């Protein structure tokens, strides 16, 4: 748009024309142009033959029909529209994650009505415990779980060995006590942005509860926004109300990668995009394509106004302004035509 | 993470006294606003204090447009 607008005036720039003159029409042209856009804009909600998503579906197909996944627009369009159907009403992209999972055909890329984790970390029993929980209850801990690894710094003084004995026992009972709170909650999955003591995993393994630490809070933020449960720092003040529930939890190997699976929450305004793809470059490129698709329909959800593509709009404008230029005599008139003359380029 | 100016502004906006002391939520020195929230504009997280002030307020103006350089110019003239 710009350079072509620049381009056509450039010969007129060779004429010693005061730029203020030129910009004067430019303001005039754009404003006059802009209103005509509004006038010939198209809505559907007055009309009858629209399902609230079909237009969104059409827009993305239109939007998607330029970037690298152009042959699968009919595929992803449903994904994002129904996905964006979840974004209400925070409507922000931060909620919905993108998982740039390597390998696999992008046609096998997944949208989960929940969250999955591209991440984990190896602790001792982390493999041992069950990895299926059909109707589990979800615990979200921000607080770490380890024997005073990084807590308040304090020296202690004790003469008696038994008191020395008692103390180190007591430090453990601290972690057990949280874990007892953890277990007696009756939930089955615990998440932590923070590191978790390996041993508790065994306790969780011993009692067949799942746990995970060092989690991205963002995905945790999704998780709490996904399952509706509340992230906790206080194990003791815990109650089932803040305790997440999900339709089913799992964790699956994908591209060799060790992922954690849970979806089916009927009221989950947040999903995540599992993006299979065998090229590293594809991922971000797709995501950027994916990113645009989301934000654009987001405004479309915001604004029920549509127009046709394929350069028709601009040609309509150029024509309108072209006739309009006939109205306005003089130096402006030449600008108007070139404004149209640059306009048609697309 | 508001800087001293920011709260200094904000304190004035709500007319409420900032408290270096954490505990005492004094009635008289307490905030009062028509509406406060977060909005999204230009893919930028925005904390909004929508206000209706008869006593007179230190208001704020919204700059929308493409070129930050234009904004900086436009605010300078503004």
């Amino acid at each position: 748009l710009a350079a072509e607008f620049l381009k056509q005036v450039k010969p007129y720039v060779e004429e010693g024309l005061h730029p203020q003159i030129i910009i004067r029409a430019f303001r005039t042209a754009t404003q006059l142009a802009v209103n005509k856009i509004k006038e010939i804009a198209v809505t559907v909600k007055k009309a009858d033959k629209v399902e609230q998503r079909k237009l969104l579906e059409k827009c993305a197909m239109t939007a998607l029909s330029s970037k690298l996944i152009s042959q699968q627009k009919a595929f992803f369009a449903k994904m994002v529209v129904d996905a964006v159907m979840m974004l209400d009403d925070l409507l922000q992209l931060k909620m919905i994650g993108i998982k740039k999972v390597q390998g696999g055909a992008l046609e096998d890329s997944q949208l989960v009505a929940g969250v999955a984790f591209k991440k984990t970390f190896s602790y001792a029993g982390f493999e041992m415990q069950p990895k299926k929980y059909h109707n589990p209850k979800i615990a979200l801990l921000n607080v770490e779980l380890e024997l005073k690894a990084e807590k308040d710094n304090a020296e202690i003084r004790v003469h008696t060995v038994e008191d020395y004995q008692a103390i180190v026992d007591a430090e453990w009972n601290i972690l057990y006590d949280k874990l007892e709170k953890i277990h007696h909650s009756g939930a089955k999955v615990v998440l932590s942005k923070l590191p978790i003591g390996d041993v508790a995993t065994q306790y969780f393994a011993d009692r067949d509860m799942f746990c995970a630490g060092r989690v991205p809070e963002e995905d945790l933020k999704r998780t709490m926004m996904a399952c509706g449960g509340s992230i906790q720092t206080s194990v003791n003040a815990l109650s089932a109300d803040v305790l997440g529930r999900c339709q089913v939890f799992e964790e699956t190997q994908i591209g060799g990668e060790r992922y954690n699976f849970f979806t089916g929450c009927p009221k989950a305004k947040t999903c995540t995009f599992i993006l299979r793809g065998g090229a590293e470059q594809f991922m971000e490129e797709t995501e950027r394509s994916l990113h645009d698709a989301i934000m654009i329909v987001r405004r479309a959800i915001k604004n029920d106004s549509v127009v046709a593509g394929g350069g028709a709009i601009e040609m309509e404008l150029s024509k309108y302004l072209r006739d309009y230029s006939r109205t306005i005599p003089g130096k402006q008139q030449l600008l108007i035509g070139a404004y149209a003359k640059a306009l048609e380029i697309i | 993470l508001n800087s001293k100016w920011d709260l200094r502004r904000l304190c004035k906006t709500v007319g409420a006294t900032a408290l270096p002391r954490l505990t005492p939520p004094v009635l008289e020195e307490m905030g009062h606003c028509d509406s406060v929230y977060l909005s999204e504009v230009g893919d930028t997280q925005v904390v909004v204090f929508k206000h209706e002030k008869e006593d007179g307020a230190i208001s704020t103006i919204v700059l929308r447009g493409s070129t930050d350089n234009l904004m900086d110019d436009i605010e300078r003239a503004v």
């Binding site: 030129i22 856009i37 509004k38 604004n303 106004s305 | 493409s66 070129t67």
Partner: peptide
């Protein structure tokens, strides 16, 4: 969506209006 081109042309509009409005350049090393 209309807004796309709507914002597009407007942003372009000021761009040149920004662009054309300068007569010289100054450089500092």
């Amino acid at each position: 969506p209309a807004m796309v081109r709507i914002n597009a042309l407007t942003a372009a509009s000021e761009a040149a209006c920004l662009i054309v409005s300068v007569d010289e350049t100054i450089k500092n090393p």
